[PDB]
Design a protein around this ligand. Structure first.
Ligand SMILES: *[C@@H]1O[C@H](CO)[C@@H](O)[C@H](O)[C@H]1NC(C)=O
Lengths: 49, 38
């Protein structure tokens, strides 16, 4: 099967970036939605608002 | 992960690895792995 993959290795080669591109995209998606502020803010101990 | 020494302290990371741990080149100086800082 691998000896016959050298004619379709390129097809195996492009699907990797198509999978790598989506994989790095979803990793970047969480950064764009949740990582807006660089400073982590602690909740105050006083709950009387 | 082999060849990288894990350290308990946390800094801002630049090279994402996954599962809440990155890697960086920090002080000689060698490659280290740590949980990133938010
Ligand atoms: C990091 O510090 C904590 C403090 O309790 C210690 O338990 C832990 O062993 C330390 N990690 C390393 C790799 O020295």
């Amino acid at each position: 099967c691998s000896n016959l993959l050298l004619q379709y290795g390129s097809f195996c080669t492009q699907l990797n970036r198509a999978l790598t591109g989506i994989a790095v995209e979803q990793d970047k998606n969480t950064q764009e939605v949740f990582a807006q502020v660089k400073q982590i803010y602690k909740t105050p101990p006083i709950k009387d608002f | 992960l082999i060849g990288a020494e894990h350290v308990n302290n946390s800094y801002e990371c630049d090279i994402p690895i996954g599962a809440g741990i990155c890697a960086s080149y920090q002080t000689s100086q060698s490659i280290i792995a740590y949980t990133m800082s938010l």
